[PDB]
Amino acid sequence: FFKDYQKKNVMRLLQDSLEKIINEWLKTDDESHTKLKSLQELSEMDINATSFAEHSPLPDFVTRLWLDPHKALDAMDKNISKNEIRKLIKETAREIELVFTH
Amino acid sequence: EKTGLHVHEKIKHMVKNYGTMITGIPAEILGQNEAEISVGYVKKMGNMKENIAEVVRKSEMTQPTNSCGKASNEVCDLLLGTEGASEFEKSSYQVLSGDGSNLKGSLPNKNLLVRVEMDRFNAPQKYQKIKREEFNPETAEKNKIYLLEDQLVYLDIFGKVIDLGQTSDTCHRLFNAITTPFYQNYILYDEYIDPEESAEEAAMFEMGEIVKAKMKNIDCWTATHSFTIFVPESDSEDTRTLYPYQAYWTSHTLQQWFSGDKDEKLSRLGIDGYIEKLALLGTTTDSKIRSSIYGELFSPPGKEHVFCTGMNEKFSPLRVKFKVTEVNPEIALQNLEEVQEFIDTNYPGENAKDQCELYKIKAQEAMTKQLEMRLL
């Protein structure tokens, strides 16, 4: 039980961190909506593609957390697979993009 | 024994003593996360090492969450296990009837946990008169009435445009009637407006009548508070008491709830009495009654008379949604045991406070480290 409970709560903390960082980086977008189009691109990027993150409009935290999560947060539990992290980043990006197409 | 009352005492004892440690989040990954979201806050001028330490100390990471839902999610997970709490969360709510009878009936004498959602009827209170070629529903302030030249729309809180069923000719007349700049962007229900004063004010009263009438069949309620109620099995019908658990967004933590014995205070109301007040919250039309009871039930301990006063008066109508499921005390107590074991194993101390100080120190040292990696 505890490892599931602990893991769920750590994911939501990483999801909390990604929400705050992206929402503040997105508050300063230009009238061409450049950051929103890029955020849209992350939501659909393949779970195995590691090249779009070559320096992009996205904030430092996201690019690094995607490419190698256990280096960007080297206290993160081994029982959180890298793909779980990448899927979380994609899901987070999708949820904020949908808010700002309406 | 493994009585359901022991489940209550264990979760209260543990959230009181350990606070945010109940999440099970390891201190190190806590500080690395809080470093990432704080990079921008660190001064770039001077003795960065002191500037890092300043942000680490001003950091409220080891304070427990004060979020209505997050606390309730936490109580469900511990009391029902990780998948029992998903089944309970996915199932349907139920609106508290006017007399609360439907909740009273949902409480057989067993170890039961109730989850409650407080909804507010957040209906629009303001309006703007705007020309069509200047109205953009994605840019405009949500939850507002908009009077275009030929249409009267409601832009709801989700960005949806709802037409209010007016003819072009009714709208053109109201659009051309409201000429005063003070009233171009105003409120919908100014009780001091006298329509007989001018055509303009007459148009304002009319529009107010249209929007009030149409807003009744537009049931956009909004979730405003979340809490749980543990109702342990009791020896007899009268010994039966309930214990509400809550945090309040931006106001207080569940740890502070237990530090003030507010569960115990509210538990002393009885079940009939608690359901009476919870129900009156949803039937009353007196805002002083509504505000006073919301304070009693939901204020931080010791603020029952300051919670909903002045600008915090509860003017919007409220409703209560609930759902009830059974608690397995042996399962809850072992879930609680496993959190206790993890706290002891990784943050040991002679007393609970020393365990809490060791956690915070571990998290600040992770934070200090992660911030130095980004400002190397």
The residues facing B115 across adjacent strands are B228, B323
Torsion of CA A50, A51, A57, A59, to 10 degrees: 30
Tell me if residue A68 falls in helix, strand or coil: coil
Chain A residues near residue B28 by CB distance under 8 angstroms: 75
Task: Give the closest-approach CA distance of A64 to chain B in angstroms.
Answer: 11
Q: Do B29 and A17 touch (CB under 8 A)?
A: no
- Which residues, other chains included, contact B316 with Cβ-Cβ below 8 Å and sequence gap of 6+? B120, B121, B122, B123
In the 3-class helix/strand/coil scheme, how is chain B assigned residue by residue? Answer: CCCHHHHHHHHHHHHHHHHHHHHCCCHHHHHHHHHHCCHHHCCCCCCHHHHHHHHHHCCCCCCCCCCHHHHHHHHHHHHHHHHHHHHHHHCCCEECCCCCHHHHCCCCCCCEEEEEEEEEECCCCEEEECCHHHCCCCCCCCCEEEECCCCEEEECCCCCEEECCCCHHHHHHHHHHCCCHHHHEEECCCCCCCHHHCHHHHHHHHHHHHHHHHHHHCCCEEEEEEEEEEECCCCCCCCCCCEEECCECCCECHHHHHHCCHHHHHHCCCHHHHHHHHHHHHHCCCHHHHHHHHHHHHCCCCCCCCCCCHHHCCCCCEEEEEEEEECCHHHHHHHHHHHHHHHHHHCCCCCHHHHHHHHHHHHHHHHHHHHHHHCC
Identify the residue whose tokens are 């199932």: B91
CA gap B125, A9 in Å, rounded: 38
Helix (H) / strand (E) containing A66 = helix A60-67
- Which residues, other chains included, contact A101 with Cβ-Cβ below 8 Å and sequence gap of 6+? none
Q: CA–CA distance from B177 to each of A22, A35, A87 (Å)?
A: 45, 43, 55
Strand B94-95 and strand B144-147: pairing? unpaired
Q: Where are the domains of chain A?
A: 2-99
Q: Which residue of B has its CA nearest to A19?
A: B37
Residue B219, Cβ density class (10 Å: 0-12 exposed, 13-18 middle, ≥19 buried): exposed
Asked if residue B127 lies in contact with residue B186, where contact means CB atoms within 8 angstroms, the answer is yes
Tell me if residue A34 falls in helix, strand or coil: helix
Q: Which two tokens stand for residue B239?
A: 């010994």
Q: Among residues B98, B67, B69, which one has the least CA distance to residue B228?
A: B69
Q: How many whole angstroms from its chain centre is CA B12?
A: 21
Edge to edge, what strands does the sheet with B112-121 contain?
B94-95, B318-326, B112-121, B221-231, B243-245
Cα B82–B85–B90 angle (5° rounding)? 130
Write the single-letter amino acid at B3.
T
Q: Which two tokens stand for residue B292?
A: 């006073």
Strand B126-129 and strand B144-147: pairing? parallel
> What was the elucidation method?
X-ray
The residues facing B19 across adjacent strands are none
Specify the length of chain A in residues: 102
> Alpha-carbon Rg of chain B, whole angstroms?
26
CA gap B68, B65 in Å, rounded: 9
Chain A residues near residue B39 by CB distance under 8 angstroms: 60
Measured in degrees and rounded to the nearest 5, phi and psi for residue A94 equal -65, -40
Q: Do B25 and A6 touch (CB under 8 A)?
A: yes
* Resolution expressed in Å: 2.7
CA gap B315, B297 in Å, rounded: 17
Write the single-letter amino acid at B61.
M
Q: Do B36 and A76 touch (CB under 8 A)?
A: no
Q: Where are the domains of chain B?
A: 1-122+221-376, 123-220
How many beta-carbon contacts under 8 Å exist across A and B? 66
* B198-202: Cβ within 8 A, 24+ apart: B202/B177
Q: CA–CA distance from A28 to each of A23, B327, B372 (Å)?
A: 9, 48, 26
Tell me if residue A75 falls in helix, strand or coil: coil
CA gap B227, B71 in Å, rounded: 8
Q: Do A17 and B37 touch (CB under 8 A)?
A: yes
CA gap A69, A82 in Å, rounded: 6
CA gap B82, A3 in Å, rounded: 10
Q: Which two tokens stand for residue B277?
A: 């007040």
Q: Which two tokens stand for residue B297?
A: 């039930």
CA gap A66, A83 in Å, rounded: 9
Task: Give the closest-approach CA distance of A36 to chain B in angstroms.
Answer: 14
CA gap B100, B322 in Å, rounded: 11
CA gap B319, B28 in Å, rounded: 42
- Which residues, other chains included, contact A96 with Cβ-Cβ below 8 Å and sequence gap of 6+? A19, A22, A23, A26, A39
Q: Which two tokens stand for residue B162?
A: 């709802």
CA gap B355, B246 in Å, rounded: 24
Residue B244, Cβ density class (10 Å: 0-12 exposed, 13-18 middle, ≥19 buried): buried
Task: Give the closest-approach CA distance of B34 to chain A in angstroms.
Answer: 8
| Sign of CA pseudo-dihedral B303, B309, B312, B318 | positive
* A13-17: Cβ within 8 A, 24+ apart: A13/B25, A13/B29, A13/B30, A13/B33, A14/A65, A14/A73, A14/A76, A14/A85, A14/A88, A14/B33, A15/A88, A15/A92, A16/B33, A17/A61, A17/B33, A17/B36, A17/B37
The residues facing B319 across adjacent strands are B119
Edge to edge, what strands does the sheet with B185-187 contain?
B161-163, B152-155, B144-147, B126-129, B185-187
